[PDB]
Structure formats: structure tokens, C-alpha cells
């Protein structure tokens, strides 16, 4: 019953003009038999050199970027160009965007490692609009600013509505838009008790 | 088998508090206000008392999940100081190192 013998590492058969992206298509752990590099890692012993790649736990503990190389990334993005769409050229400045698209909706995603993809913070939404963008009479603007309280910032003239009460993000988003519509329409309405200010 | 009989009793306390959470919330809400008649509040004060003692959520103790140690636990990992140090001092906790400064 002879013991099994290991083959010579396949790096020996690798040419120096190979297609390396094909060797590491995706993220994989460091394989000393597939990486054709004399890399060494480890604090050396006195009168010693750093440890070699074979049987090196430290190199295995590293999150290597062998799959992501300048040659791979350029070849990858070349394929991913078909997906992208072109930003409208007219919106060449931030001020130009505020003119045509005054409402700013903030949504946050979170990426973590685990079996569950759920994060409680993903439901929160924040709407930001400038009162200048809204068509408000002198009466309306004063009423809008008193109702919103600290949501309005005099320095920036921006109204901030933060909605996280609802479970989902599509509900919290629709709620902030609702809060804006009621505040705007209510601001224009004039109540008899307002004449006693 | 759980670590010990103390961890077993705690597990039951945690599973009976989950069943009676809505009930103890609805009843206790009737007591934590000043808008309802005091007669109703005095009666709700006894309905909550009549529920089983293990439903009460203040009888839960946080114990090390691996050794059932009642004190010395770190709430982020649910481990005792002795068990945490064994995993940390061996490089087994992701991102935990010794503090030199």
C-alpha cells in the first residue's frame, strides 16, 4: 500500500505570457501551487529568511486581490459598459439640478457578511427640498416655516423631512412625499384664527 | 444538553416571556397612564400580577452561552471574560487585538 505522491505544482507549466485573469477568474484563497510568484511572508527568525509560500498560513489569512488585477478590471468594465446609461448632459452643474429637480431623496443600503441580509437602518428615508423651489406666497412661507419647526434651516433654506416610522423603505419614502404635500397645501390655506397673530 | 441546570431555567424564562409579551404589554399599558379610571387600573394591577412569574422579563439573566457564567459577560458577544480572552488571545475573533497605547 504505497502512499500517494503529489504532482509537481502547475506553476511550472505556466508561461510568462499567459492569460492570468483566466487563472484566477473569481475570488479564491491563496494557492501556492497556482500562484507563480516566489512570495514570502512571516517575521523571519534570527539568521533566517521569511517563510516560503508553501504551507504558509499567513498568506492564506490575507484577502488577496489576485482575481482583481489591472488587466482583469479593464476587461471586466469593458463588458459592463453595455449596462450603463448616459447622464443627461444638460445637468452639468449642481445648481442646474436644483432648478429642474429640487427634491433630494436620501436612501441608505448596508452590505455585511452573514446569513441574514436584514438591517434595521435601511427603512429610514430623508427628503430635502428648498423652500425657494416651492411656489410659496409670503403668507404661505411663514406658515410653512412655523409648522415644520426645526426641520427648516434658515441659513440654507432647506426643509428636511426624515421618515423612519413605517416598516419598509417604499412606505417611508411615500410618507415623506405625503408630508410635503400636506404641509404645502396647508400652508396656503388660511384659517380664521390666523388673523389673531 | 445545556451547560447546566441554571442555563436551562433561564432558557424557559426567556421562552415564556416571549409568549406573554403582547399580553403583559396590553395590560401594563392600562396602568401606565392617568387617563383611565383608577378602578380599572387597580383591576389591571392584579391581572398582571396573576400571570405566571416566569413571564416577568426582569427574571432573565444574561449568562455566558458557553459556560453559563452569570457575571463577567460581554453583551456584544454573550461570552464571559474568561471565554472571550481564550478566543481573542488565539486570533479567533475577527478584528480583536490587544490594546497598546
Amino acid at each position: 500500500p504505497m502512499r500517494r505522491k503529489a504532482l509537481p505544482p502547475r506553476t511550472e507549466k505556466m508561461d510568462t505570457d499567459q492569460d492570468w485573469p483566466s487563472v484566477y477568474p473569481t475570488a479564491a484563497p491563496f494557492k501556492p501551487s497556482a500562484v507563480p510568484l516566489p512570495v514570502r511572508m512571516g517575521y523571519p527568525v534570527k539568521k533566517g529568511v521569511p517563510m516560503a509560500k508553501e504551507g504558509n498560513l499567513e498568506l492564506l489569512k490575507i484577502p488577496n486581490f489576485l482575481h482583481l488585477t489591472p488587466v482583469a478590471i479593464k476587461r471586466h468594465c469593458a463588458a459592463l459598459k453595455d449596462f450603463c446609461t448616459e447622464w443627461p448632459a444638460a445637468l452639468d452643474s449642481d445648481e442646474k439640478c436644483e432648478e429642474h429637480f429640487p427634491v433630494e431623496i436620501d436612501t441608505a443600503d448596508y452590505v455585511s457578511s452573514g446569513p441574514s441580509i436584514r438591517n434595521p437602518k435601511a427603512r429610514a428615508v430623508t427628503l430635502r427640498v428648498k423652500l425657494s423651489s416651492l411656489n410659496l406666497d409670503n403668507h404661505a412661507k411663514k406658515k410653512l416655516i412655523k409648522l415644520v419647526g426645526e426641520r427648516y434651516c434658515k441659513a440654507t433654506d432647506v426643509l428636511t423631512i426624515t421618515t423612519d416610522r413605517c416598516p419598509l423603505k417604499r412606505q417611508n419614502y411615500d410618507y415623506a412625499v405625503y408630508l410635503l404635500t400636506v404641509l404645502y397645501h396647508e400652508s396656503w390655506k388660511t384659517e380664521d384664527w390666523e388673523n389673531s397673530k | 444538553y445545556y451547560v447546566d441546570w441554571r442555563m436551562l431555567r433561564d432558557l424557559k424564562r426567556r421562552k415564556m416571556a416571549y409568549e406573554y409579551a403582547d399580553e403583559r404589554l396590553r395590560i401594563n399599558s392600562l396602568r401606565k397612564n392617568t387617563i383611565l379610571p383608577k378602578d380599572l387600573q387597580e383591576m389591571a394591577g392584579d391581572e398582571i400580577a396573576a400571570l405566571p412569574r416566569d413571564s416577568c422579563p426582569v427574571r432573565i439573566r444574561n449568562r455566558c452561552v458557553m459556560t453559563s457564567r452569570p457575571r463577567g459577560v460581554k453583551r456584544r458577544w454573550r461570552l464571559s471574560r474568561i471565554v472571550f480572552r481564550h478566543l481573542a488571545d488565539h486570533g479567533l475573533l475577527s478584528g480583536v487585538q490587544r490594546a497598546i497605547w
Binding site: W193, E194 | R14, Y18, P57
Partner: protein
């Protein structure tokens, strides 16, 4: 300073829009809103799922040891200590037949 009619009526118009408490409520009665707006302590996954299922781990690994797909060095150590102890005549007595009658 005091709140004039305009100030108070504006505050109620605001609360009505933002779904806040509209009436004048004591601090005591504001707990009812807190109790029903916050998940209770017993309903949080950290509380009711504080422990791993120690029964599933102990039972699953024991079954794997009997299928030959897992090796428990700790159990094999104890299994041989029992064998040697029984040979020495120090084994576990049968239930109901203990030294005391």
C-alpha cells in the same frame, strides 16, 4: 414665555400633520405611546434567541459520532475512563439499588 392662541393652534396643526400627540398629555400618559411604539424587551431576537440550541449541537454531534462521520476525542476519553472504572468495581449503581436502602 407663554404660548399665545396662534402659537398653540399652530402647534396642534403641526402635530396633526406629523402624526404626533395632539392633546396635552402628562409625562405619565406618554408612556402608552412609548410602550406601543417600541418593541418590548422580551420580543427582541437578542433576548429570546440569546442561547444557541445546546440540545441540537449535543444531539447532532452525538448522532454523527455513532455514524462514524465525527470523532469526539473528549467522549472517547470519557468512554474509556468508564470502562476502566467499571472493571475496578467503581461503576454506577443501578437506580433504586443504591448503598442506602
Amino acid at each position: 414665555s407663554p404660548l399665545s392662541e396662534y402659537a398653540l393652534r399652530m402647534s396642534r396643526l403641526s402635530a396633526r400633520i406629523f402624526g404626533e400627540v395632539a392633546r396635552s398629555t402628562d409625562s405619565k400618559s406618554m408612556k402608552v405611546v412609548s410602550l406601543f411604539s417600541e418593541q418590548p424587551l422580551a420580543k427582541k431576537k437578542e433576548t429570546y434567541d440569546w442561547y444557541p440550541n445546546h440540545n441540537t449541537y449535543f444531539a447532532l454531534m452525538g448522532n454523527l459520532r455513532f455514524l462514524g462521520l465525527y470523532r469526539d476525542e473528549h467522549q472517547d476519553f470519557k468512554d474509556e475512563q468508564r470502562r476502566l472504572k467499571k472493571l475496578r468495581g467503581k461503576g454506577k449503581p443501578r437506580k433504586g439499588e443504591g448503598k442506602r436502602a
